[PDB]
Amino acid sequence: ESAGELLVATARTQARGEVLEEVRRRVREALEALPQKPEWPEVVRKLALEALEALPGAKALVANPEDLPHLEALARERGVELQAEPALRLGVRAVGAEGKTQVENSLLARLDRAWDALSSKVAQALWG
Template sequence: MSLAEILESEIQGEISAIQQQANTRAAEIVAKAQEQAQALIDSRTRLLANEKAAGLTRARSAADLDSNAQRLSASDSLQMRAFQEAEAQLKVIPQHPEYPQIVQRLLEEAHAALPTAEAIETSSGELETVRQVAQNLGIQAPVRVNDSVTTGVRLVGAGGKTSLQNTLLGRLQSGRETLSAQVSRLLQE
């Protein structure tokens, strides 16, 4: 099974989890985004999910006002704002105490897919956390700064010819198309 298929399978599983919780709780957009975050970053990040839910609740309130005035044109705008808020919430995750646990999972997944990595890259603000996690996992690859890699890690293969990025922002973007359709449907309801 290829990495793309594994990631696609993981995304589909996460989307299914979001749909189940939306049906059982008749959730607002906020609950959808909270469940997406929990599926992506594991149940150990409950505090982060609550903070994200609070931010998305604000976006949901704005969405309700806009949809009453102009349902069709507001839908695109509301989706964009919801994803921006989700991205903003994900960008502050490295400041949370649970972040080493999140990095551990991201690094384990990336290392399982690219076990011959010669280097690990992450942003300067996450460098020490990633170094410590890599050391704890027994991964010998050097950890270096690449400020374009935030909220996770990028493993670089032999000679830099291959790489694998596993970040929270990347996961949000890879599931965006499917989530957009679900958000649109919820807005219409």
């Protein structure tokens, strides 16, 4: 008798999970195309500024070679270097002065770090 509604609860929960993962994979696909969007050079500088202000006295900056030409002007006026790296797609990383502390700032990591907070917002929007 309660097992009957158990199936209803499980089915609705799995459907909600399916649609929520649909939302997350769609936003993941859209964000990966943002580097191709011409606004990406306008956002890399904001990201590097946030990463550099988050770590006072940072020694160097790490980003993709494709993004280095845009960040080069920002680096000299802040008195920091810039590093080419095969990894670190669509993001910048701020290393500490002593080489022990690092600060990572990329859109995809921010997505995971904000999903826990925004899951309720997404669910309410879907089922308001």
